[PDB]
Amino acid sequence: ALLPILSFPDPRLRTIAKPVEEVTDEIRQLAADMFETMYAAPGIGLAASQVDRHIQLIVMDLSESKDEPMVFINPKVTPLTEETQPYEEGCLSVPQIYDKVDRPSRVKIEAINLEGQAFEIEADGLLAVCIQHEMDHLNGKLFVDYLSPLKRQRAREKVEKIVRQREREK
Ligand SMILES: O=C(O)C[C@@H](Cc1ccccc1)C(=O)SCC(=O)c1ccccc1
Numbered sequence: 001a002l003l004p005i006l007s008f009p010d011p012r013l014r015t016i017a018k019p020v021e022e023v024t025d026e027i028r029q030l031a032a033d034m035f036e037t038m039y040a041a042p043g044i045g046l047a048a049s050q051v052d053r054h055i056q057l058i059v060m061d062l063s064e065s066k067d068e069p070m071v072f073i074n075p076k077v078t079p080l081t082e083e084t085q086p087y088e089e090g091c092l093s094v095p096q097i098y099d100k101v102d103r104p105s106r107v108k109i110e111a112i113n114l115e116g117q118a119f120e121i122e123a124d125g126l127l128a129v130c131i132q133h134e135m136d137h138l139n140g141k142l143f144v145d146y147l148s149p150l151k152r153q154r155a156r157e158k159v160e161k162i163v164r165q166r167e168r169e170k
């Protein structure tokens with residue numbers, strides 16, 4: 001029913017994504033499938049890389065109500081400061097694993113929407129954390145890449161256990 005989400009340490013999460021050529025109806029369908037996949041997990045962000053579609057497409061909904069969807073296509077993210085903010089990040093590609101990452105606390109985001117319109121907004125708080133995390137997917141990076149290698153290894157062993165249990169539950 002929903003799109004399959006790749007799991008760390010799958011090497012395909014390391015693929016650097018290509019920009020989207022045109023916002024065709026097939027990329028519109030992929031976005032809507034991504035949203036369903038993301039809302040089901042549940043999560044608040046998903047990059048197309050995570051469903052094994054190596055294109056510069058991110059879906060996101062930061063709302064409690066699951067009713068403020070956002071799309072970023074071909075995004076450029078630029079820090080507006082060297083101040084970082086800590087945040088406890090998770091990731092549907094590192095299921096049930098959470099730890100602290102310090103990222104620039106304010107960023108400019110420029111991207112296009114599902115109608116092919118360009119936009120530029122500035123973000124802080126949870127938006128800046130999540131857009132940087134999702135941009136990182138697009139460049140083949142996971143939030144575990146910023147943890148010590150014993151946190152990484154333990155994350156990996158734990159995730160392989162979770163994935164096996166999820167297969168078994170099937
Ligand atoms: O790459 C991902 O799969 C998305 C990820 C986004 C994210 C979470 C936390 C920090 C930074 C980025 C997640 O969706 S995890 C979901 C989550 O933590 C959450 C879900 C519902 C309400 C509140 C938080």
Ligand SMILES: [Zn+2]
Nearest residue numbers: 090091092093
């Ligand atoms: Zn992620």
